[PDB]
Amino acid sequence: GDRRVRLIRTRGGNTKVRLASDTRINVVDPETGKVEIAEIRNVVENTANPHFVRRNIITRGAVVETNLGNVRVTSRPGQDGVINGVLIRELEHHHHHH
């Protein structure tokens, strides 16, 4: 019936730049200790399903999505320039697809 297009373009090369065209975050895995600079792919905290959204209004206590999964923003975007946070298990418990 309804031809619902959710075009999630696979944007991800080796483009070196400060967080604006490539949102970077230091994801500190709080159990394992894995500290890795991932990219914030979506800021799906409340803005669920890509509906013309590219909202990079990233605040402390927000659930963001990264290369390593969902993270709590522990800092403010602009402190160390880059964002930092701790890896969390909000999304993808039973299903690991969305």
Upper half-sphere CA count for residue 83 (Cβ side, 13 Å) = 31
- This entry's atomic model was obtained through NMR
| Topology adopted by domain 23-90 | Thrombin, subunit H (2.40.10)
Residue 46 near residue 61 (C-beta atoms within 8 A): no
Beta strands in 19-62 (DSSP E): 24-28, 35-39
Three-state DSSP state, 65 = strand
